Design an enzyme around this catalytic site. Structure first.
Site: not given
Ligand code: AZA
Ligand code: AZA
Ligand code: AZA
Ligand code: AZA
Ligand code: NA
Ligand code: NA
Ligand code: NA
Ligand code: NA
Lengths: 295, 295, 295, 295
Positions: D10, D57, D176, D228, D256
């Protein structure tokens, strides 16, 4: 401390390309969002402030546009393979490129029953994606997918016979709504390099079309015992129809639609066989996954 | 201080309804999101903590489901009119109801060339909407709309001859991409009440279909001098085809796609007649609006 | 057909401005998103493809950046008034400018208990907005607002004594959770022009601060009889503290948190006085609005 | 075909819990979104429509609420470990539980300089997350993270000395803007089971606080040579301050902000040392990642 893993690049690069047939006047458009991340001998940019090893992410962006200008952008498996190969071949110290492409729908408009030469509609937010990992000395790994395919069937889905214990309140049912957003991924056998990818070009569009068709037909026709059982049937068929696929993975939410008991109001009957009005639930949702491979 | 205006109700009420043909086995689904806001003699709930005048928003929610159970939910103009009328008739001190409905697409799947009886696909996030204002003694005002219709044409759009001054950098062009998300609203003549709305039921779906068709054909076929000129042509045609509409309003973003000059790289030609690869711009965007009425 | 209303311009223009104190080394940043729509004698661009009357939306974009370079961008009421006035004065045939500004939070970081000279954090998605309508011969109308202020109180909210009929299932309560996203707008008296707006500059930030403080204190301290009653108390106080405001409007969702009955499981008590775990509901939600003015 | 991997459960389970101090009258709220996916001997639900192996579920959803009622929900590392352990112990055939928790901020309001007993504000969309993998016979693996921490510094960032070739247009810079949304994850040494997790409970909140503080101070104080280099400094410090962490991973977009050349307009100076007004770019963005471990 030590750098255990590192990758960097440019995300969310939007690209549009138009093809113009001079003979017929027909135009065809492609639009994608591209991400490229590089790995290699770049640790010193992190540890020693040595920028000499950095191919600037801005340059990665330029390269994506230049590559799109000089090469086909379809099928995306090919374009991604060309783009990734470029980086590992051009730069001695770059040893892997990871390319993700999301393809957006621009479907040719029909006006008065005829296909229009240069007008397009976005029919749904369904995407076709690729993930291409190009690794020096290890070939090209491609995962193709479709995502955002939203479907609903109003009957012919069941769910009974599940485990019941002190945590269980869910009633068994022999007739429910089933709705999901399909995310399906097929992983190709490893390719030795670009020449091999080029050799299989026609298989890419055909396999996408097959995956889509199998998904839709199976969903529509299966009298579904569960999401689990229906999704397995889809995967089994895709693997049967394309030998170059190694695995198929589905990830499916179960988007619940609840009955509304209205009997408190003038004995109005709106449950079971009399259910007409339902309440779609935004959350929570079931989430069901499976990866299917070959025996 | 005094209360100058007040309205309250329930928003984001998701509703699904299924219709089952017993003869043919065909099922048809409708899904909407509904908002209902009420006005009337309710000032004292604000000024004196007098809750006796409040129809609880939870009760408004119940009423929406009950009304959907007992009435057609299509066309949405009719359903909205039924729902709004209920509140002003049932409660003496409620004098206006404001109903907004968003209809979600569930389009019947074609499997192997035949329409499937109970399976549907969400083909795009385009919506059909209504706003219905039901005001005691003043009838029913309905505004119908379509929204989220995303289109692109790759040529046959121009933009030249605009004002040039010291704030202007934009170059004139005789060939550009035009892409937009269409929001179009048609406002009906005031209706005297439910009986009159019922009398015009077939016109609602037909006018929506006309509005959509006129929008698509005009966009595709106009050699557009500007968004302004093209949108006016759309509105003029809708007003011509349906006499019961008083005004048509369009609101259109101009979603820009920029040329990319690649000449810095090996003299690569990618501008003007040689433009193939473009950069879609997420923002900013032009926004062009107009309301067209009758002479 | 005739053009009944028209406006056009540029939306989603992101702008950042930095101020640098040379004496102290302290830097202060402002970031906004701006929309400007113009009206005037522009019908012929729609009806006759006459672009000569169009100030290009690209030029509107340039003008926003130029104006931000040459003028203070704070308070936003002033910047919006300067920007709108520019268009109506510069262009003979433009008679109204509609400026919407959304201000994004960049709050100075405290590092080791001291304010940092040039580092900022986005503390919440709360916005401060203005809508400025500059109309030739009719002065300047300003609506200021705060939005996206999300709050919750876990007790001291009640809701009982509402209308009960055959559509009602809601139980009366003397202790519930109340949570909302506050949207509050105060509308200033009409200003004759820029000189008058300039004369009141200090009142803009002070009134925003007052509106925010009154909202938070009233929400926290009121033993709330309903959203209606609590919101009216907020509006009354704002009007009392600033004579130049004509009306205050609140729009408040009631974001429901439901009790979960767990008694089916080993008689676990989780309702009423024993309620500890609740289920937040994404939808539907109550929506309560009021506009408060002077007697 | 064969099932190679499967998990189901779920997602998007919203949970709120309140704690009430009877002595002091102070209330404290917690709100989370929880996902639980199970693995085990469940292949037959996919291959043979055997639902007997499925814990529904819906039952998983019930279990989350019951567990929250009976146990502390803080720190989330502990709650996730309790929840995952429940599933593997209760059901013989379930062998792994994967629990993801997103914690939403509800920060106590200060009214008139004093902390309010039961009123809270959402100060930013920053989250604290955990991923807990409970695997039968293999212990408990916990990854803790913070995400959505959005910061900007207006100077003291540089980027020069990078690789220049025929794909490069980026100018070197010594001043920058640097802005990012911080996603930082610290991975704990494997724990043998719940008793061991319980033994380390105080370390969880303290390490989160340390990670946050180190991130903010380093960002603010580093005269950054690149994203980096700055991110590596952050990771190194976290690893130094908590011996039970094995690796730290950062994923940072480079959001940017571009200079705007206004010299075409009356020679206005807005670049380099004269830059005051900038254009924030929504896309594309650099994306820089690194995982740092111990020598
Ligand atoms: O910080 C940056 N890392 C990068 O790899 C990069 N490539 N363009 N500008 C950038 N600035
Ligand atoms: O098709 C379903 N599969 C499941 O595992 C399930 N669990 N509740 N309702 C359901 N319906
Ligand atoms: O504060 C409230 N106001 C209302 O109008 C309402 N209706 N249901 N619950 C409610 N709570
Ligand atoms: O169609 C357009 N209309 C306009 O008003 C405009 N302004 N810039 N580009 C434009 N394109
Ligand atoms: Na290489
Ligand atoms: Na009435
Ligand atoms: Na003017
Ligand atoms: Na087990």
């Amino acid at each position: 401390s030590a750098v255990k893993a590192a990758r960097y690049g440019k995300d969310n690069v939007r690209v549009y390309k138009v093809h113009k047939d001079e003979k017929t006047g027909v135009q065809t458009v492609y639009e994608m969002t591209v991400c490229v991340l590089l790995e290699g001998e770049i640790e010193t940019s992190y540890t020693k402030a040595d920028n000499s090893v950095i191919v600037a992410t801005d340059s990665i962006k330029n390269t994506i546009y230049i590559t799109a200008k000089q090469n086909p952008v379809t099928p995306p498996e090919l374009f991604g393979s060309i783009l990734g190969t470029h980086f590992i071949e051009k730069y001695n110290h770059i040893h892997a490129a990871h390319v993700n492409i999301v393809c957006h729908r621009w479907t040719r408009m029909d006006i008065d029953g005829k296909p229009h030469p240069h007008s397009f509609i976005r029919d749904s937010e369904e995407k076709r994606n690729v993930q291409v990992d190009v690794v020096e000395g290890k070939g090209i790994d491609i995962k193709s997918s479709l995502s955002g395919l939203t479907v609903l069937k109003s009957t012919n889905s069941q769910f009974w016979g599940f485990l019941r214990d002190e945590y269980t309140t869910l009633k068994e049912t022999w007739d429910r709504i089933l709705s999901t957003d399909v995310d399906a991924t097929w992983q190709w056998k490893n390719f030795s390099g670009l020449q091999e990818v080029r050799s299989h070009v026609p298989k890419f569009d055909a396999t996408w079309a097959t995956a889509r068709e199998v998904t839709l037909k199976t969903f529509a026709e299966d009298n579904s015992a569960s999401v689990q059982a229906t999704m397995y049937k889809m995967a089994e068929q895709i693997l049967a129809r394309q030998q170059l696929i190694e695995t198929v993975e589905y990830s499916l939410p179960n988007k619940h639609y609840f009955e509304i008991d209205l009997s408190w109001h003038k004995g109005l009957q709106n449950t079971g066989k009399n259910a007409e009005v339902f309440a779609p639930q935004s959350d929570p949702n079931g989430l069901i996954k499976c990866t299917v491979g070959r025996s």
